[PDB]
Design an enzyme around this catalytic site. Structure first.
Site, PDB file in Angstrom:
ATOM      1  N   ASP A 139       8.962  15.466  -0.710  1.00 25.87           N
ATOM      2  CA  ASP A 139       8.528  15.088   0.634  1.00 25.87           C
ATOM      3  C   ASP A 139       9.421  13.979   1.229  1.00 25.87           C
ATOM      4  O   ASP A 139       8.948  12.898   1.661  1.00 25.87           O
ATOM      5  CB  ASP A 139       7.046  14.673   0.592  1.00 25.87           C
ATOM      6  CG  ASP A 139       6.404  14.543   1.977  1.00 25.87           C
ATOM      7  OD1 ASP A 139       7.004  14.854   3.031  1.00 25.87           O
ATOM      8  OD2 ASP A 139       5.239  14.109   1.999  1.00 25.87           O
ATOM      9  N   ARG A 143       9.236   8.614   7.121  1.00 28.84           N
ATOM     10  CA  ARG A 143       7.889   8.068   6.913  1.00 28.84           C
ATOM     11  C   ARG A 143       7.665   7.649   5.443  1.00 28.84           C
ATOM     12  O   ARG A 143       6.767   6.856   5.132  1.00 28.84           O
ATOM     13  CB  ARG A 143       6.806   9.062   7.387  1.00 28.84           C
ATOM     14  CG  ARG A 143       6.794  10.393   6.612  1.00 28.84           C
ATOM     15  CD  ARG A 143       5.697  11.388   7.035  1.00 28.84           C
ATOM     16  NE  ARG A 143       6.006  12.642   6.311  1.00 28.84           N
ATOM     17  CZ  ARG A 143       6.886  13.558   6.709  1.00 28.84           C
ATOM     18  NH1 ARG A 143       7.489  13.487   7.896  1.00 28.84           N
ATOM     19  NH2 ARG A 143       7.125  14.609   5.920  1.00 28.84           N
ATOM     20  N   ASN A 144       8.475   8.206   4.544  1.00 28.92           N
ATOM     21  CA  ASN A 144       8.416   7.853   3.131  1.00 28.92           C
ATOM     22  C   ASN A 144       9.527   6.896   2.661  1.00 28.92           C
ATOM     23  O   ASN A 144       9.774   6.763   1.448  1.00 28.92           O
ATOM     24  CB  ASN A 144       8.458   9.156   2.281  1.00 28.92           C
ATOM     25  CG  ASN A 144       7.079   9.705   1.996  1.00 28.92           C
ATOM     26  OD1 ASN A 144       6.154   8.953   1.768  1.00 28.92           O
ATOM     27  ND2 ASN A 144       6.942  11.045   1.980  1.00 28.92           N
ATOM     28  N   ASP A 157       7.416   7.458  -2.205  1.00 24.54           N
ATOM     29  CA  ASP A 157       6.617   8.665  -2.044  1.00 24.54           C
ATOM     30  C   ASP A 157       5.162   8.230  -1.991  1.00 24.54           C
ATOM     31  O   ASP A 157       4.570   7.883  -3.013  1.00 24.54           O
ATOM     32  CB  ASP A 157       6.861   9.635  -3.196  1.00 24.54           C
ATOM     33  CG  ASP A 157       6.088  10.932  -3.030  1.00 24.54           C
ATOM     34  OD1 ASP A 157       5.492  11.146  -1.953  1.00 24.54           O
ATOM     35  OD2 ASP A 157       6.048  11.713  -3.993  1.00 24.54           O
TER      36      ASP A 157
HETATM   37  C1  LIG Z   1       1.985   0.580  -4.326  1.00 20.14           C
HETATM   38  C2  LIG Z   1       2.827   1.821  -4.665  1.00 20.14           C
HETATM   39  C3  LIG Z   1       2.436   2.688  -5.702  1.00 20.14           C
HETATM   40  C4  LIG Z   1       3.213   3.817  -6.026  1.00 20.14           C
HETATM   41  C5  LIG Z   1       4.360   4.114  -5.264  1.00 20.14           C
HETATM   42  N1  LIG Z   1       5.175   5.228  -5.658  1.00 20.14           N
HETATM   43  C6  LIG Z   1       6.315   5.668  -5.088  1.00 20.14           C
HETATM   44  O1  LIG Z   1       6.746   5.269  -4.025  1.00 20.14           O
HETATM   45  C7  LIG Z   1       7.072   6.784  -5.782  1.00 20.14           C
HETATM   46  C8  LIG Z   1       8.419   6.955  -5.471  1.00 20.14           C
HETATM   47  C9  LIG Z   1       9.175   7.953  -6.103  1.00 20.14           C
HETATM   48  C10 LIG Z   1       8.565   8.749  -7.074  1.00 20.14           C
HETATM   49  C11 LIG Z   1       9.397   9.847  -7.767  1.00 20.14           C
HETATM   50  N2  LIG Z   1       8.714  11.157  -7.715  1.00 20.14           N
HETATM   51  C12 LIG Z   1       9.484  12.149  -8.529  1.00 20.14           C
HETATM   52  C13 LIG Z   1       8.679  13.468  -8.612  1.00 20.14           C
HETATM   53  N3  LIG Z   1       8.332  13.947  -7.249  1.00 20.14           N
HETATM   54  C14 LIG Z   1       7.588  15.234  -7.324  1.00 20.14           C
HETATM   55  C15 LIG Z   1       7.562  12.943  -6.461  1.00 20.14           C
HETATM   56  C16 LIG Z   1       8.392  11.651  -6.353  1.00 20.14           C
HETATM   57  C17 LIG Z   1       7.222   8.566  -7.408  1.00 20.14           C
HETATM   58  C18 LIG Z   1       6.471   7.568  -6.773  1.00 20.14           C
HETATM   59  C19 LIG Z   1       4.754   3.233  -4.255  1.00 20.14           C
HETATM   60  C20 LIG Z   1       3.992   2.092  -3.926  1.00 20.14           C
HETATM   61  N4  LIG Z   1       4.418   1.270  -2.918  1.00 20.14           N
HETATM   62  C21 LIG Z   1       3.957   1.310  -1.644  1.00 20.14           C
HETATM   63  N5  LIG Z   1       3.066   2.249  -1.255  1.00 20.14           N
HETATM   64  C22 LIG Z   1       2.599   2.303   0.003  1.00 20.14           C
HETATM   65  C23 LIG Z   1       3.025   1.340   0.932  1.00 20.14           C
HETATM   66  C24 LIG Z   1       3.955   0.385   0.524  1.00 20.14           C
HETATM   67  C25 LIG Z   1       4.477  -0.665   1.423  1.00 20.14           C
HETATM   68  C26 LIG Z   1       4.134  -0.633   2.788  1.00 20.14           C
HETATM   69  C27 LIG Z   1       4.629  -1.632   3.642  1.00 20.14           C
HETATM   70  C28 LIG Z   1       5.460  -2.620   3.104  1.00 20.14           C
HETATM   71  N6  LIG Z   1       5.804  -2.626   1.792  1.00 20.14           N
HETATM   72  C29 LIG Z   1       5.328  -1.681   0.943  1.00 20.14           C
HETATM   73  N7  LIG Z   1       4.374   0.375  -0.762  1.00 20.14           N
END
Ligand SMILES: Cc1ccc(NC(=O)c2ccc(CN3CCN(C)CC3)cc2)cc1Nc1nccc(-c2cccnc2)n1
Ligand SMILES: NC(=O)c1cccc(-c2cc(Nc3ccc(OC(F)(F)F)cc3)ncn2)c1
Ligand SMILES: [Cl-]
Length: 286
Positions: A139, A143-144, A157
């Site tokens: 995705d 927005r991500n 994500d």
């Molecule tokens: C709090 C948290 C918990 C989990 C995640 N996870 C991820 O961001 C992420 C990124 C990449 C992957 C890799 N993945 C590989 C496999 N495929 C299928 C999916 C993606 C997985 C998770 C982010 C966050 N951070 C987050 N979440 C929402 C908002 C914000 C945020 C908003 C505003 C200012 N600063 C931070 N920050």
């Protein structure tokens, strides 16, 4: 379990009381994600939690994945609380929030063509890393992504598909898809790969090039697949250098195998303007 001598030790597990939980982030746009402070560091963090009461394994799956990835342009895991409910995933907090809103709201003198190129480059680096590690994003879109100090950009994500209101995500094949970012083979054959992330990257590049315009503007969702199948593609945005638009068009090859790898894309960004200024190209196009 918190002591290194323990057979139950996990370096990622942190003390819940080390974090002071504040309000929900972004009004609620991220679901159960809260602003936090990691006490001993006076560091603002983002904390994802589960809402009351099968998605437990999806959450734990996400925590496991995040433990496996580390890159300057991927949001960084700081720790987890997964010994007992309620489960937390803690990441760094990024000062300027999501890239889509940042693009739409930014001062354009600051966020010039050079900065836009840097943001695109950083995203291609994150994706090259994911490609190398045999992960798929699924995705990718503005927005991500998040924006921090000095136009640092990190790919995230947020699991937006069943949170976001509006028609960004719409019903398709039993789930919610962001149709205008989705590769045709994903729409039609449920085929997702690093190459479908490449297609999405092209749409994200278009978002960057337009300061966050919504893609295929004025075109009904019902028509997107048919148009793409008949070789329609979004036109070059106003001011977009031809070499960048060529890269967009490469990402949007119908056959996923014909699209560049993220390693190729990243290399292209490094070479494209090695001897020439992106500012000059934009000026020339305008
Ligand atoms: C709090 C948290 C918990 C989990 C995640 N996870 C991820 O961001 C992420 C990124 C990449 C992957 C890799 N993945 C590989 C496999 N495929 C299928 C999916 C993606 C997985 C998770 C982010 C966050 N951070 C987050 N979440 C929402 C908002 C914000 C945020 C908003 C505003 C200012 N600063 C931070 N920050
Ligand atoms: N005020 C203006 O002169 C005006 C009007 C319309 C567009 C623009 C404009 C376009 C523009 N385009 C642009 C910049 C960088 C770019 O590369 C990348 F996508 F970031 F990699 C792709 C497209 N950059 C900066 N300004 C400026
Ligand atoms: Cl994966």
């Amino acid at each position: 379990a918190m002591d290194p001598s323990s057979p139950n030790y996990d370096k990622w597990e942190m003390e819940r009381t080390d974090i002071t939980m504040k309000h929900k982030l972004g009004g609620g746009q991220y679901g159960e994600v809260y602003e936090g402070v990691w006490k001993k560091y006076s560091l603002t963090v983002a904390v994802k939690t589960l809402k009351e009461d099968m998605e437990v394994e999806e959450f734990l799956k996400e925590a496991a994945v995040m433990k496996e990835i580390k890159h300057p342009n991927l949001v960084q895991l700081l720790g987890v609380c997964t010994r007992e409910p309620p489960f937390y995933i803690i990441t760094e907090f990024m000062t300027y929030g999501n890239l889509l809103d940042y693009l739409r709201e930014c001062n354009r003198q600051e966020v010039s063509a050079v900065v836009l190129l840097y943001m695109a480059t950083q995203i291609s680096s994150a994706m090259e890393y994911l490609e190398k590690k045999n992960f798929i994003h699924r995705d990718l879109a503005a927005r991500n992504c998040l924006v921090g100090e000095n136009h640092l950009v990190k790919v995230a994500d947020f699991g937006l598909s069943r949170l976001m209101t509006g028609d960004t995500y719409t019903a398709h094949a039993g789930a919610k898809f962001p149709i205008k970012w989705t590769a045709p083979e994903s729409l039609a054959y449920n085929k997702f790969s690093i190459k479908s992330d490449v297609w999405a990257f092209g749409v994200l590049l278009w978002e960057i090039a337009t300061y966050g315009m919504s893609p295929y503007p004025g075109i009904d969702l019902s028509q997107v697949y048919e148009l793409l199948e008949k070789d329609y593609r979004m036109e070059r945005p106003e001011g977009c250098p031809e070499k960048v638009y060529e890269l967009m068009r490469a990402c949007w090859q119908w056959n996923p195998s014909d699209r560049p790898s993220f390693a190729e894309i990243h290399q292209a960004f490094e070479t494209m303007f090695q001897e020439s200024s992106i500012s000059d190209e934009v000026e020339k196009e305008l």
